[PDB]
Amino acid sequence: EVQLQQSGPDLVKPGASVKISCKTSGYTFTEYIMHWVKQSHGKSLEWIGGIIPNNGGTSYNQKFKDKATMTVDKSSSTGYMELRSLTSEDSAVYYCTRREVYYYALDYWGQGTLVTVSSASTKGPSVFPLAPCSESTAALGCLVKDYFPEPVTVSWNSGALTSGVHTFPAVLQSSGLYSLSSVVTVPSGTQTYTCNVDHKPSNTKVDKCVERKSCVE
Amino acid sequence: EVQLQQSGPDLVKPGASVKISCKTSGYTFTEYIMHWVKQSHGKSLEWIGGIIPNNGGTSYNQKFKDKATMTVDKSSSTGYMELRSLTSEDSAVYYCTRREVYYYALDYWGQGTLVTVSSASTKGPSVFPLAPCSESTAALGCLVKDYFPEPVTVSWNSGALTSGVHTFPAVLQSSGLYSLSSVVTVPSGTQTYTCNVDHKPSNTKVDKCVERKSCVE
Amino acid sequence: DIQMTQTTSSLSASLGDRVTITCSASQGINNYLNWYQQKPDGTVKLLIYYTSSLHSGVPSRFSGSGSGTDYSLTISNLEPEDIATYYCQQYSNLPYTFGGGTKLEIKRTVAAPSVFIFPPSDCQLKSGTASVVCLLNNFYPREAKVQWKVDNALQSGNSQESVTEQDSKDSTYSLSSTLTLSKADYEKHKVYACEVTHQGLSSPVTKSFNRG
Amino acid sequence: DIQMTQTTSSLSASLGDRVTITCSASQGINNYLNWYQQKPDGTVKLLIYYTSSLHSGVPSRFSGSGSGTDYSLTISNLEPEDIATYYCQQYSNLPYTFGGGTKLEIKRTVAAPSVFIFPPSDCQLKSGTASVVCLLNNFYPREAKVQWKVDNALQSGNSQESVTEQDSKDSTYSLSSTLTLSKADYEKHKVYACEVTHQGLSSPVTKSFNRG
């Protein structure tokens, strides 16, 4: 019923500006207040501000009085929040939330929007298969490497396969580019195994079949 | 020195119209006459017409007096030729040629432009690797299937590899889509093998590494 | 502004046990406290509001307690789905403030890793880099050792590791080590192995492949 | 309009031999004849003009001959690079007309095919179709037989073939047969083989693979 769908990730220029999107559904919009929350990589949660959609009025955290700026289009059931002159300190996940009053609390959260701030230009990833050589448990995966900035999605069979999957946290490399691994364990007809990488900050989507070579002469 | 580079292939609507391009270099353009030649799949060669660039005057074969229409931009060193109300009988390769006078002859040919004429909409190909299981001669290839219309280029290592390669003629299938095979033989460091498919009529380019799984547990 | 303090930012507990996460305000907040649960994927649910009150959905093994400057969230029966970072928040005064988080581990019976090694793709050798990947799967506890040998020569300072959050069904980890060589170096050697030490392995486990 | 006739549209000849391609106009064209060579890739070179005259580059084993309505191109020493379709053209009258072509084969010593079989990619099984491919490489002559067996059961009417133009260095062919099954059918069977009969094989050659 109730959803808050947020603008995809962002790489941003150290000095630029960015408007995040929060598209709401499953409630009448103006009958609830919208707050925004920041989460820095240390995973502390700060309250940024609040907006009343019915009206358009706001109450900013004074930490961000200069940086953030919130608004709403009543029509599209959508609030926004614009960071000004971004430094590296703006590099964070940004949730949008709804206030319920029973009293007060934030009873519905966005999934979040990762913002990065850097000169370094975008680079989408190379995706290579991981397949073994030689149990009723074999493993495949694929290797998503040298990309920037941090967020990639990884899927298997377009969402079909959830059991067995482990997508690992990325590692920053000496290069300054990230690199990730995704692996599946399986039971041992020959179902295929396709890993779907989506790196939105470069509009890079890749579907790589991982070939298990069973046949013999 | 001397070249005639032609507009890439064409799929065309049974009833449409098309302007082929012939971009010339290595001679002063207006000092030579340009003829166009048709070649139908039976591989008969018909003369279509002639144009004098200096002037713009023409002499059409009366077979094509209605169909074809030739012109030149002096500036871009480029002649053209436009087929009107195309039927299936227009489906052919179309060379542009230069006339030399020693007497007369056609001493420089374009590579040609394949035109197809059909309602059937474009379909770019799926490309799958061909790799064996188990001599100092092993074979790989890759399989370019279910595409339309007929022309695909196939390369290995972006042009690097010419020895050992055999790209097979396509076969029309019951589907009405074509399908092709490209194979390389090799000597047995582990050089990679990458087949570069270009199907211009769908703007489909694919680079598929063909993985030879040598390792063992 | 009102500081919220959760002194213990990492707490581990056995499937079954009662657990108590703790929150301290700089001054009285009049039971105007909420508790938030954040799953590893990053999603943030709301558990308890006004100190003692359960958001619909939340099972009744979650309890809210306290008053003044001191508040506790307790999970009575502990289960794997409860792996998360729990946060407190006050709405007593603006700005709204949040505790700095308590990350909760689940303690379960020892389980060794399944180990898989994966050689680089030919598609990768074009890059000029080779990446060999070793995979430790569904183990507990998190502590584990991974050594790369190449031709039975122990490697050093050419590998990077990464470890998943604990699974919320079976309370395990998995781990991904990546040895990185040049194409040149990767094709100077035949044997590639990772050897794993873990509590649940009476002796080490080596998985190998033989290039060519 | 002036018809150009090359009665023999396919002629095969031994490395070494003299060869003569022939061209007949419907009426006198006054040595206003040109000869064109078209390579398999499709490229079209110009060999001889005004009956007897060699375009620079063309080696002097090419000769132009004739007059009136009858003209010949002869290759004195034959070599593999000469594999092409040769065409005559007249510029005597508009419209310019062309002979219907003479395709020239080179005859060389028998050579058996190397045979390779290739199973379908897992990426392909997603399609719902499987394609097994058999490859006959560098053989002469062109005549060859390819049989698909599946689990030692001979297949019929589920295969398509394709054959290259003759190579212009070693005067050989290569051939590509493609058996096509459903995913369902391909995964009901273990063994897949193609068996090749050719002149240069004292007995047939089977290449096989064993699915799973």
Author numbering:
A (entry chain A), B (entry chain A): 1 to 102, 106 to 137, 142 to 195, 199 to 227
C (entry chain B), D (entry chain B): 1 to 212
Text lifted from the article:
A promising strategy in cancer immunotherapy is activation of immune signalling pathways through antibodies that target co-stimulatory receptors. hIgG2, one of four human antibody isotypes, is known to deliver strong agonistic activity, and modification of hIgG2 hinge disulfides can influence immune-stimulating activity. Furthermore, we explore structure-guided design of the anti-hCD40 antibody ChiLob7/4 and show that engineering additional disulfides between opposing F(ab’) arms can elicit conformational restriction, concomitant with enhanced agonism. For the most biologically active variant, C232S κC214S, disulfide linkages between C127 and C233 on opposing heavy chains were identified and termed a disulfide cross-over (amino acid numbering follows Kabat nomenclature, κ stands for the κ-light chain). Given this consistency across four different cellular read-outs, we conclude that engineering additional disulfides to link opposing antibody F(ab’) arms results in a compact and rigid antibody molecule with augmented biological activity.
In an alternative approach, we investigated the introduction of mutations outside the hinge using the disulfide engineering software Disulfide by Design 2.033. The software predicts pairs of amino acids, based on a given structure, that will likely form disulfides if mutated to cysteine, and identified the amino acids T222 and κE123 on opposing heavy and light chains outside the hinge. Again, assuming the hinge disulfide cross-over is maintained, the C232S + T222C κE123C + κC214S variant was named cross-over + T222C κE123C. The cross-over + T222C κE123C variant migrated as a single species at ~150 kDa, suggesting the presence of additional disulfides linking heavy and light chains together. X-ray crystal structures were determined from pepsin-digested F(ab’)2 fragments. Anomalous electron density confirmed that the structure-guided design process was successful, with disulfides forming as intended. In the cross-over + T222C κE123C variant, the disulfide cross-over formed (C127-C233) in addition to two disulfides (C222-κC123) linking opposing heavy and light chains on opposite F(ab’) arms. This observation readily explains why the light and heavy chains did not dissociate on SDS-PAGE or CE-SDS despite the fact that the C127-κC214 disulfide, which would normally link heavy and light chains, cannot form. The designed variants are slightly more compact with hinge angles of 125.3° for the cross-over + K228C and 124.9° for the cross-over + T222C κE123C, compared to a hinge angle of 126.6° for the parent. Flow cytometric analysis showed that HLA-DR, CD23, and CD86 upregulation were significantly greater for the cross-over + K228C and the cross-over + T222C κE123C compared to the parent cross-over, as was B cell proliferation, measured as an increase in 3H-thymidine incorporation.
